[PDB]
């Protein structure tokens, strides 16, 4: 029972309701524990590591290499882009779920785990309406400035790239999925530009008929707009402030040289974490309105050497 | 405790390790008594909690003053819609950032508030509604008229639902001084549902909001979030969007909602009393516009609804 310092009380009991329901009624996860999965001409495995809502509950990804399966990273070792020319999303959160899931940089493998906030796992405050996840070998490094009286610096959220499934079918915990890049979208808070790319599911009823931000509109109406409300809105009830969103939306090309140029950061922090382990080893509502671009590259940034790195 | 999933990886389900309570709760506001003296419209209420959240017979009792007494009244019918000051009145029934579906009961005496049952089990919103929530008195959706555009249309059958903007959040089952701004509709499934769009008497830019349009000026992005908010609330249950009419209403349209509403609840109250004495894609359905029809007089009151 929750007590609240006024003579009404809440039973809380969870046998009466359908929070329960709401929340896990929709998890869409693989049928066994270990379960293996072909990608790009490749055999890898997903294995679930202990029991959901538990605090040491993780992914794990594994490659056959000959007679047996070795370990993997999805943020290194899964392919970015497919030999079909698509790209492999990294499904953390299925649609319709609560759960908070995040591909971990600072564990071993950089295995999926549940978030945790205020020291408690995180859960969603609203259900998500779209598959979500990241793509492999993106990294947003905050080593490279984006700007805008005197100037205004931004730099990357420094985590892998966000990515969104328009697809109508609920993909599964820890998939990998080959998707389309249709368009992108950028948070700016707390000083830092948040990308999230708009995808589409390869094997979607419209997938060729779908391909920029506007062809989804006739086929997945509001879609493009509740997800941008979504996101402006989906912390309301912890933060009371709504996020920013910048106006400027990218198209299918502008998203797509965002992957790449994502990827060339991962390529740029996986040298400087090389070099660095020899070196010492051996209102704002126009605030929304601005047009941000490329910088200027800080050289006394240095890498986050608790990112796990191979 | 464990969830069946019927699948080899299962689920904890330990409320004291995650935030779903936190979610849900940390934002609960109510009054501090069980008892709760109130005044609107120069006259004198009581607010009465009856019983504890999350059991099956919590209930919101309102209560008048009849001189010496105090007598059993129902938010429904007994509290004036619209009061002397211009202002109509709006009974809190979920408060801001909060998930609890609590509905005023036609089918029950006095219409208490009690909370929804879905399926057997109370019932729970899916996402936390951004705005205070509740229904306008005297007001009734009466299913005895049809709309049209062919395509018919009829009434909610339950009393018209109105939108707080205010920031303040409200407390449940508060009575309400609000000014009326706009209007949207929903149109499943086959019946229209207005929802008035207002802002709190007491909000710090009460003055300076009157219409849909001057709030982006205070409150940015309100109105595009009721749209989508309302869009998708039950998507996690239906798997389908809601459909919402692409016509909003100004302000004066929606004052004359209300008041043409309130015939409506008029008529129903007159008529049942009448009836008992005899005793011995869809895309374009969004830009559809309705229009009024015919009122069939082949209807009949329901005779569930409590009436004094």
Redesign the interface.
């Known amino acids: 029972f929750?007590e609240?310092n006024?003579?009404?009380?809440?039973?809380?009991?969870?046998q009466?309701?359908?929070?329960?329901?709401?929340?896990?009624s929709?998890?869409n996860?693989?049928?066994?524990?270990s379960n293996i999965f072909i990608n790009n001409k490749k055999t890898y495995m997903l294995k679930?590591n202990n029991?959901?809502?538990?605090?040491n509950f993780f992914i794990s990804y594994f490659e056959k290499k000959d007679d047996n399966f070795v370990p993997i990273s999805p943020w290194h070792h899964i392919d970015l882009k497919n030999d079909d020319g698509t790209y492999n999303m990294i499904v953390e959160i299925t649609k319709?779920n609560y759960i908070k899931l995040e591909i971990q940089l600072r564990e071993k493998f950089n295995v999926i785990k549940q978030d945790k906030?205020?020291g408690?796992?995180?859960?969603y405050?609203?259900?998500i309406?779209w598959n979500y996840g990241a793509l492999p070998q993106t990294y947003e490094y905050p080593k490279h400035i984006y700007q805008n009286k005197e100037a205004l610096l931004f730099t990357g959220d420094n985590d892998p790239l966000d990515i969104l499934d328009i697809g109508s079918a609920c993909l599964k915990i820890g998939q990998v999925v080959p998707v389309k890049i249709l368009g992108a979208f950028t948070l700016i808070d707390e000083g830092e530009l948040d990308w999230k790319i708009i995808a589409i599911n390869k094997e979607d009823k419209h997938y060729e008929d779908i391909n920029s931000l506007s062809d989804i509109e006739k086929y997945y109406?509001?879609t493009l707009?509740?997800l941008l409300?979504?996101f402006?809105?989906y912390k309301?009830?912890?933060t009371k402030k709504?996020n920013l969103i910048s106006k400027q939306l990218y198209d299918k090309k502008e998203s797509e040289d965002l992957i790449m140029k994502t990827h060339h950061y991962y390529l740029e922090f996986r040298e400087d974490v090389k070099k660095l382990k020899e070196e010492h080893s051996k209102?704002n509502?126009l605030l929304e309105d601005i047009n941000i671009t490329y910088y200027k590259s800080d050289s006394a940034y240095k890498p986050d050497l608790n990112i796990w790195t191979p």
């Open positions: 929750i609240t006024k003579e009404l009380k809440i039973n809380l009991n969870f009466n309701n359908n929070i329960i329901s709401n929340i896990f929709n998890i996860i693989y049928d066994k524990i679930y029991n959901i809502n538990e605090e319709y906030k205020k408690k796992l995180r859960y405050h609203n259900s309406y109406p509001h707009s509740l409300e979504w402006r809105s309301m009830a912890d709504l209102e509502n």
